[PDB]
Design an enzyme around this catalytic site. Structure first.
Site, mmCIF file in Angstrom:
data_model
loop_
_atom_site.group_PDB
_atom_site.id
_atom_site.type_symbol
_atom_site.label_atom_id
_atom_site.label_comp_id
_atom_site.label_asym_id
_atom_site.label_seq_id
_atom_site.Cartn_x
_atom_site.Cartn_y
_atom_site.Cartn_z
ATOM 1 N N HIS A 196 40.032 21.774 -5.107
ATOM 2 C CA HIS A 196 39.326 22.946 -4.556
ATOM 3 C C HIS A 196 38.193 23.442 -5.448
ATOM 4 C CE1 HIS A 196 42.878 24.827 -6.626
ATOM 5 N NE2 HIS A 196 41.900 25.545 -7.143
ATOM 6 N N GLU A 242 45.439 17.056 -4.255
ATOM 7 C CA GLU A 242 44.789 18.286 -4.774
ATOM 8 C C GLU A 242 44.197 18.128 -6.190
ATOM 9 O OE1 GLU A 242 44.202 20.586 -2.569
ATOM 10 O OE2 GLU A 242 43.041 21.856 -3.915
ATOM 11 N N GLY A 270 42.447 32.395 -10.913
ATOM 12 C CA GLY A 270 41.822 32.128 -12.183
ATOM 13 C C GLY A 270 42.641 31.222 -13.083
ATOM 14 N N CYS A 276 43.870 28.210 -12.011
ATOM 15 C CA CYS A 276 43.767 26.824 -11.591
ATOM 16 C C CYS A 276 43.039 25.916 -12.578
ATOM 17 C CB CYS A 276 43.162 26.727 -10.200
ATOM 18 S SG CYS A 276 44.292 27.328 -8.924
HETATM 19 C C1 XNV Z 1 43.611 28.872 -8.423
HETATM 20 C C2 XNV Z 1 42.127 28.815 -7.959
HETATM 21 C C3 XNV Z 1 41.329 30.113 -7.932
HETATM 22 O O1 XNV Z 1 41.505 31.044 -8.682
HETATM 23 O O2 XNV Z 1 40.908 30.382 -6.648
HETATM 24 C C4 XNV Z 1 40.424 31.708 -6.374
HETATM 25 C C5 XNV Z 1 40.554 32.094 -4.887
HETATM 26 C C6 XNV Z 1 44.544 29.488 -7.336
HETATM 27 C C7 XNV Z 1 45.900 29.969 -7.913
HETATM 28 C C8 XNV Z 1 46.832 30.645 -6.932
HETATM 29 C C9 XNV Z 1 46.306 32.021 -6.421
HETATM 30 C C10 XNV Z 1 47.560 32.797 -6.062
HETATM 31 N N1 XNV Z 1 48.505 32.264 -7.042
HETATM 32 C C11 XNV Z 1 48.147 31.039 -7.528
HETATM 33 O O3 XNV Z 1 48.807 30.342 -8.281
HETATM 34 N N2 XNV Z 1 44.748 28.516 -6.270
HETATM 35 C C12 XNV Z 1 44.531 28.844 -4.955
HETATM 36 O O4 XNV Z 1 44.210 29.961 -4.582
HETATM 37 C C13 XNV Z 1 44.701 27.705 -3.939
HETATM 38 C C14 XNV Z 1 43.377 26.958 -3.757
HETATM 39 C C15 XNV Z 1 43.620 25.829 -2.882
HETATM 40 C C16 XNV Z 1 43.811 24.912 -2.175
HETATM 41 N N3 XNV Z 1 45.258 28.205 -2.676
HETATM 42 C C17 XNV Z 1 44.543 28.419 -1.517
HETATM 43 C C18 XNV Z 1 45.152 28.846 -0.383
HETATM 44 C C19 XNV Z 1 46.541 29.119 -0.347
HETATM 45 C C20 XNV Z 1 47.307 28.929 -1.482
HETATM 46 N N4 XNV Z 1 48.703 29.062 -1.536
HETATM 47 C C21 XNV Z 1 49.544 28.426 -0.592
HETATM 48 O O5 XNV Z 1 49.154 27.863 0.426
HETATM 49 C C22 XNV Z 1 50.994 28.523 -0.945
HETATM 50 C C23 XNV Z 1 52.092 27.993 -0.170
HETATM 51 C C24 XNV Z 1 53.228 28.324 -0.874
HETATM 52 C C25 XNV Z 1 54.649 28.050 -0.569
HETATM 53 O O6 XNV Z 1 52.818 28.986 -1.985
HETATM 54 N N5 XNV Z 1 51.481 29.136 -2.020
HETATM 55 C C26 XNV Z 1 46.657 28.503 -2.718
HETATM 56 O O7 XNV Z 1 47.260 28.358 -3.790
#
Ligand code: XNV
Ligand code: PI
Ligand code: PI
Ligand code: NH4
Ligand code: NH4
Length: 181
Positions: free
Chosen positions: A41, A72, A146, A148
């Site tokens: 992403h 991913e 933040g 990731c």
């Molecule tokens: C890291 C990337 C970044 O900061 O993006 C800013 C928007 C994040 C870390 C996540 C945020 C909430 N807690 C974390 O550990 N990654 C994401 O936001 C990812 C990106 C992708 C793909 N993302 C996007 C959309 C949804 C989700 N979560 C789920 O779908 C999910 C399902 C289950 C079960 O648990 N979570 C997601 O992590």
């Protein structure tokens, strides 16, 4: 927990950097030669900012399994002279489960922070951000945007890269040695 932290700090110092793409700010782990890894992403373009410096990207590989299922992870080859210390030997050939792991982050929001995330389980299949995804490792801790690209480690092992979560559940993509030559 102590030896995991000692390992993690030394690993980040030698192999990690802070990267910005147009899609956000990430921790980035260099693997060997000029190859590094980001969450898919991050969507790196032809250049990235690496420690505030523009660096060209020579190749980017969005990893999928043999049936095209999302992992991913994006591998990227950088246009730079410095070579990463080769850490392929710290990567397992299959998903690693451990009783105690440390997640290491280094970004402007989380400057050199280490989190004891407890037990890591091979969760497997997850629909992550609307995309069927495999080789997910799960751990329970208070997750945040933040983090990731954060590097998931145990003593003498790099397990994975943090790619997602919700609430108090976090997921890494397992970082397997066969993804690299
Ligand atoms: C890291 C990337 C970044 O900061 O993006 C800013 C928007 C994040 C870390 C996540 C945020 C909430 N807690 C974390 O550990 N990654 C994401 O936001 C990812 C990106 C992708 C793909 N993302 C996007 C959309 C949804 C989700 N979560 C789920 O779908 C999910 C399902 C289950 C079960 O648990 N979570 C997601 O992590
Ligand atoms: O990041 P860099 O600029 O390549 O050192
Ligand atoms: O499925 P893979 O190709 O082995 O990742
Ligand atoms: N991008
Ligand atoms: N530090």
């Amino acid at each position: 927990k102590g030896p995991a932290f000692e390992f993690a700090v030394a690993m980040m110092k030698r192999n990690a950097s802070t990267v910005k793409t147009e899609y956000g700010e990430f921790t980035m782990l260099g693997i060997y030669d000029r190859w590094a890894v980001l969450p898919r992403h991050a969507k790196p373009g032809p250049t990235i900012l690496m420690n505030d410096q523009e660096v060209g990207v020579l190749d980017a590989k969005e990893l999928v399994d043999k049936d095209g299922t999302n992992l991913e992870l994006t591998l990227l080859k950088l246009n730079r002279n410095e070579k990463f210390r080769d850490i392929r030997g710290f990567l397992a050939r299959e998903e690693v489960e451990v009783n105690e792991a440390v997640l290491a982050i280094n970004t402007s929001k989380f400057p050199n922070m280490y989190i004891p995330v407890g037990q890591v389980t091979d969760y497997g299949f997850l629909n992550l951000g609307g995309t069927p995804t495999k080789r997910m490792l799960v751990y329970n801790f208070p997750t945040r945007a933040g983090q990731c690209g954060g590097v998931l480690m145990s003593t003498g092992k790099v397990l994975g890269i943090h790619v997602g979560g919700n609430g108090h559940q976090g997921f890494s993509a397992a970082l397997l040695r066969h993804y690299f030559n």
